[PDB]
Design a protein around this nucleic acid. Structure first.
Ligand SMILES: [Mg+2]
Lengths: 618, 79, 512, 51
RNA sequence: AGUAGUAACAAG
């Protein structure tokens, strides 16, 4: 008898038991070495997809940029970055016509946000890139460093605390002939440095076999990217076909709503087909100048300063410089030696050291390589513009109404800037095929390519969108991974509260099951008791705290009034996950116990601040 | 780097908690079973002394008691 | 907010063709009206840009093509099916404080040692250096008994054989590029693809033995609050009926063993960075009568732990007891050196038998992230329940009725779970739960990028097959590309090969 | 040590029947020391045979 | 040797 769990799919539908297809219990793959090869491969692919563009040498920097706009129309199904600005503007105009007044309201809200934006919003974020150190630093540290640098070379108009003032300081810093670093710097090198994108390899990434390159921008463009993202979020919030930034339950509601809307008019003589797919090479296919044109159309009849602020970001993103990472490592077996060659030395190096593929990539990247930074004018890098691309896709999605197609077929659906579900209605199979072909050609006209391998078409009723599986009205949210459910490592009460809050948040958001939540609570309680040696007073486990806990247990009368940190029973459950432990058991504590527990004169204190909220040593 | 492993390692030690010197007066140095509660050695950085969780449990089961009824009042969101 | 000269030039360099200045482009955008541009562009494009819909019939899908080559070998961190334990009965008192003395007691409980000899030699390694290690492990134990002060942890002396088996002084010296510019053989590291391997039959037996029940309890859980809401009652019923059936599965023993081994190894690496610390494999369980039981599996000798990144490799030497003759399946033990260390006396229903007891000694390596994720193997349990109730809850949605009591109380085999020459094997809910737990445990143990890629690639094929079975007329745009992507991840990992074989079997049996 | 650990009912010692010809506190200070010297075993880096 | 897989660890 050979056990085959996949045979369970013979009876149970795969949508009901899809959790067996997510091996999210092992360690995700990591990257050993440098990301220079991946970065060079990405740049070569991006420039190959635009090989029929216009090459123009820069003036301020001198790097040769590539312009694929208004290039030759594609002749095959291969990816192409040739996007016509007229088609994009027409799609934006049609989207505005279908939903009047969205752009003006979004602009007003974004202007209000800009006028009401502080400078500390840049402190919170991911690991950013520091140009002064040319390294990867936390956002707060990089912000402090650039503030000190702008204080050295006198530019101190951002001390008021407004982000607009910092943006103006960055604006004025680009015209300085000389720059000083706490290493004297001139103007051209500073301008090149300000456009540098630090490249590394993404770790802990699932669903892929080979590693991929991820880029991080500098500290100068953070505010402009923030403003652009705010505008895109404001636009998306008024669109019902977007997938961001709603939650899991809201996403399920959106799926049900769109399915019901499409199926509320389908008669017996009308056929409906649903396709699910992804977008291949999405990041390296969208020209930043297309985003610039879209933003320009967005800000029609607006103050000049606001539209200039919006347009600053695509201008810099159209002339970005990509770093080459760390470098490479060479080995000599006979001499038994290993050496490290930095990325800056790749400009002048013999090709006999590398293999065929590496030397081919180096040869292809050398003409675009200057001072250790390559030119990457076309295409986004990893994820900087998500919701703007979602707006671009939803424009094409909205372009599928009957008033525009003017044919017996018509399509709608949802998109999340990489995943898309498209449902098309037509009276016959030929109409379905014609609508699918029209949608594919329209997407190709803008720079959107549908991955044929990852896309499939069936009859309406079962489909998938962003790991949400819809089947006959039932949706399962399996787009996240369960956390470790362990101690945080601060103190007793803080760790208990944080664990309970994490369990509650996972239950309310990630659609965690009740039995699974109870099991997670049990595991967390076990880990907490083992870590803090706070076992129950009626147990037979010998620790250093065993004697004191036993004395406390035999001293008290109401056993349920003791906290878990003091050997008390675990009264937490599903219905009590929103109540702190101290307040939950407050009515069961003894008078002396509660008097001593929260005494304000305890030496440990200089959630409720009790004696368990001590401070460890560094 | 990893707070969980650091917390486990620190709790595996003898005197992980820091406290004011005043704790030298409210609680005895030795338990009735002979276990130590705090150490005379001084930490680096200030005059604070070292204290084991046994001292916390001892204070919980043996310590000054006062009429504390304001806690449910001032703390309302948690209560 | 004005634009300066440098930024003005930068903007002028960031415009579409046939646009001299940014003001001209802005004016053009401000006065634009859509006039049939999209239709004209569509007519201009050739007919080669098309997306045909290829029907997916009952004969279109083909079985996956497994790679060929030498048979795959075992690559787990410790023995799973052939592991042998030396057990002692720990009473209620004397709680577990030191594992070294427990290992010493477990070793003392055995009296059938003999002179070790090599049975299955290692091909690419120096065999005697392994043997000289094992005897040393014995000797360093006896030096404990005559020591004037009993130590907590034992650090092995860096002998000649331990220096070779732990990879000491093996990395090349780090020198600057300037001093080695002119070297005739100075090249970069060889970034070659993994060698292809062919699927073997031992992994199926391993999985089959992983789902069986044991005679001991391996997991103990704490208590929670009383049940008040009906949802709490249903959750408690589901959790209890899952735990009471899954507590005695061997996968729980594997989880506990891996968690303990990884935790001990990580602690030793953090503490003793420059010591050859000896770490024994120890597990704890509860007997049916209700008494503690401590089992010893073997020993681990850990090298240096000077780790800077999260991908640095610590080398260790693992010796594990076993009762399986390595000569039955030599290809499974390619990276193992096996000795013969004793003669166990087994008392069974047939009486007294004598079985030789071997010792599998091998050199392995691990990283910090692997050790960290090995300490969280218990989450597999948390996943397994999630794979059950979410299924059962699904059966509620189609019926608008809680089917919790309608599935656990069904005293009949209801789910197809196995394969037999007679036909598809049927099983109850408990067998399904054990199988899911074993699958999660094996995913945790054999985690690799190949498996993650293959599962994601084959999910779409599974969905297509399900849609075909639902008479929804599925269609594909490029089936060959999807098949090539699926087959790209099958290189040398036995777990992924077994999963691919399972998928092929399911595809064969789903159209009959 | 194990036999001592099996008990959990210790308390602060006090003199009940004093010795007539001897210094009573010197006895009491002895007993507490016997406890303390036991605890110093548990934190010792190397467990000794005799104390 | 071994870990590992498109490049690295096997101390600096
Ligand atoms: Mg998809």
């Amino acid at each position: 008898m050979d056990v085959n769990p996949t045979l369970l799919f013979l009876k149970v539908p795969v949508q009901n038991a899809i959790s067996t297809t997510f091996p999210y219990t092992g360690d995700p793959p990591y990257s050993h070495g440098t990301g220079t090869g991946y970065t060079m491969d990405t740049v070569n692919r991006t420039h190959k997809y635009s090989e029929k563009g216009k090459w123009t040498t820069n003036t301020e920097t001198g790097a040769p940029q590539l312009n694929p706009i208004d290039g030759p129309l594609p002749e095959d199904n291969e990816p192409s970055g040739y996007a016509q600005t007229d088609c994009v503007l027409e799609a934006m105009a049609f989207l505005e016509e279908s939903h009047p007044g969205i752009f003006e309201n979004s602009c007003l809200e974004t202007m209000e946000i800009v006028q009401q934006t502080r400078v500390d919003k840049l402190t919170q974020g991911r690991q950013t890139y520091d140009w002064t150190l040319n390294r990867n630093q936390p956002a707060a540290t990089a912000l402090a460093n650039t503030i000190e640098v702008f204080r050295s070379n006198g530019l101190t108009a951002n001390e008021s605390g407004r982000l607009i003032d910092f943006l103006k300081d960055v604006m004025d810093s680009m015209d300085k002939e000389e720059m000083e670093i706490t290493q004297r710097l001139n103007k051209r090198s500073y301008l090149i440095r300000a456009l540098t994108l630090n490249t590394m390899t993404k770790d802990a990434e699932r669903g892929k076999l080979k590693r991929r390159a991820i880029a991080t921008p500098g500290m100068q463009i953070r505010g402009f990217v923030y403003f652009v993202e705010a505008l895109a979020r404001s636009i998306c919030e008024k669109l019902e076909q977007s997938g961001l930034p709603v939650g899991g339950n809201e996403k399920k509601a959106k799926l049900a709503n769109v399915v019901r809307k499409m199926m509320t008019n389908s008669q017996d003589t009308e056929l409906s087909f649903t396709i699910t797919g992804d977008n291949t090479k999405w990041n390296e296919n969208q020209n930043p100048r297309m985003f610039l044109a879209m933003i320009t159309y967005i800000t029609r009849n607006q103050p000049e300063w606001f539209r200039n602020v919006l347009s600053i970001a695509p201008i810099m993103f159209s002339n970005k410089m990509a770093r080459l990472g760390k470098g490479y490592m060479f080995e000599s077996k006979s001499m038994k030696l290993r050496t490290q060659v930095p990325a800056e030395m790749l400009a002048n190096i013999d090709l006999k050291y590398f293999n065929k593929s590496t030397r081919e990539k180096i040869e292809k990247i050398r003409p675009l390589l200057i001072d250790g930074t390559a030119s990457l004018s076309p295409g986004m890098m990893m994820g900087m513009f998500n919701m703007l691309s979602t707006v671009l896709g939803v424009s094409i999605l909205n372009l599928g109404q009957k008033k525009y197609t003017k044919t017996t077929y018509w399509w709608d659906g949802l998109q999340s800037s990489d995943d898309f579900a498209l449902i098309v209605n037509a009276p016959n199979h030929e109409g379905i095929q014609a609508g699918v072909d029209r949608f594919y050609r329209t997407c190709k006209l803008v720079g959107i390519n549908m991955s044929k391998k990852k896309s499939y078409i069936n009859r309406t009723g079962t489909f998938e969108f962003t790991s949400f599986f819809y089947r006959y009205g039932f949706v399962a949210n399996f787009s996240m991974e369960l956390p470790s459910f362990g101690v945080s490592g601060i103190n007793e009460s803080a760790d208990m509260s944080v664990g309970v809050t994490v369990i509650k948040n996972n239950m309310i958001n990630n659609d965690l099951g009740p039995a699974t939540a109870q099991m997670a609570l049990q595991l967390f309680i076990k880990d907490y008791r083992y870590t803090y040696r706070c076992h129950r007073g009626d147990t037979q486990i010998q620790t250093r705290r065993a004697f004191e806990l036993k004395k406390l247990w035999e001293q008290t009368r109401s056993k349920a009034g003791l906290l878990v940190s003091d050997g008390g029973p675990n009264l937490y459950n599903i219905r009590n996950l929103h109540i702190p432990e101290v307040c939950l058991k407050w009515e069961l504590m003894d008078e002396d116990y509660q008097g001593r527990l929260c005494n304000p004169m305890n030496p440990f204190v200089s959630a409720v601040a009790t004696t368990h909220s001590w401070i460890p040593k560094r | 780097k990893n707070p969980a492993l650091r917390m486990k390692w620190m709790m595996a030690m003898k005197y992980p908690i820091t406290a004011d010197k005043r704790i030298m007066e409210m609680i005895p140095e030795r338990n009735e079973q002979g276990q130590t509660l705090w150490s005379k050695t001084n930490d680096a950085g200030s005059d604070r002394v070292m204290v084991s969780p046994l001292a916390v449990t001892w204070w919980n089961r043996n310590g000054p008691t006062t009429s504390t009824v304001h806690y449910p009042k001032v703390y309302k969101t948690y209560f | 907010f004005e634009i300066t000269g440098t930024m003005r030039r930068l903007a002028d360099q960031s415009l579409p063709p046939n646009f001299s200045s940014l003001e001209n482009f802005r004016a053009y955008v401000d006065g634009f009206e859509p006039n049939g541009c999209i239709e004209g562009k569509l007519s201009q494009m050739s007919k080669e840009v098309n997306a045909r819909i290829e029907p997916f019939l009952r004969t279109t899908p083909r079985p996956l093509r497994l790679p060929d080559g030498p048979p795959c070998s075992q690559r787990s961190k410790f023995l799973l099916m052939d592991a042998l334990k030396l057990s002692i009965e720990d009473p209620s008192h004397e709680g577990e404080g030191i594992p070294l003395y427990d290992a010493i007691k477990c070793m003392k409980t055995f009296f059938g040692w003999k002179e070790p000899n090599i049975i299955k030699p290692h091909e690419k390694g120096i065999n005697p250096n392994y043997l000289l290690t094992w005897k040393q492990v014995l000797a360093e134990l006896q030096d404990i008994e005559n020591e004037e002060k009993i130590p907590r942890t034992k650090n092995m002396k860096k002998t000649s054989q331990l220096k070779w088996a732990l990879g000491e002084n093996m990395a090349p010296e780090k020198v600057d590029f300037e001093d080695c510019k002119d070297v005739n053989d100075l090249k970069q590291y060889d970034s070659d693809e993994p060698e292809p391997r062919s699927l073997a039959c031992w992994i199926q037996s391993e999985f089959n033995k992983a789902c069986e029940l044991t005679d001991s309890s391996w997991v103990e859980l704490d208590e929670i609050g009383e049940d008040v809401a009906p949802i709490e009652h249903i959750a408690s019923m589901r959790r209890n009926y899952f735990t009471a059936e899954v507590s005695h599965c061997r996968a729980t023993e594997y989880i506990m063993k891996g968690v303990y081994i990884n935790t001990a190894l990580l602690n030793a690496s953090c503490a003793a960075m420059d010591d050859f610390q000896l770490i024994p494999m120890i597990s704890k369980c509860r007997t049916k009568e209700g008494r503690r039981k401590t089992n010893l599996y073997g020993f681990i000798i850990k090298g240096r732990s000077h780790l800077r990144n999260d991908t640095d490799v610590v080398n260790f030497v693992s010796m594990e007891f076993s009762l399986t003759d390595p000569r039955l399946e030599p290809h499974k033990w390619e990276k193992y050196c096996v000795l013969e260390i004793g003669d166990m006396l087994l008392r069974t229903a047939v009486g007294q038998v004598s079985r030789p007891m071997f010792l599998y000694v091998r050199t392995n390596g691990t990283s910090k992230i692997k050790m960290k994720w090995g300490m969280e193997m218990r989450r597999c349990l948390l996943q397994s329940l999630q794979q059950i109730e979410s299924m059962i809850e699904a059966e509620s949605s189609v019926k608008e009725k809680d089917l919790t009591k309608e599935f656990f109380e069904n005293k009949s085999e209801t789910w197809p779970i196995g394969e037999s020459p007679k036909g598809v094997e049927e099983g109850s809910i408990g067998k399904v739960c054990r199988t899911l737990l074993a699958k999660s445990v094996f995913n945790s143990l054999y985690a690799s990028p190949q498996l993650e890629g293959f599962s994601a690639e084959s999910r779409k094929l599974l969905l297509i097959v399900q849609a075909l079975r639902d008479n929804l007329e599925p269609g594909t745009f490029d089936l060959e590309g999807l098949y090539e992507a699926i087959e790209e991840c099958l290189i040398n990992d036995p777990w992924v090969l077994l999963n691919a074989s399972w998928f092929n079997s399911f595809l064969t049996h789903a159209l009959r």
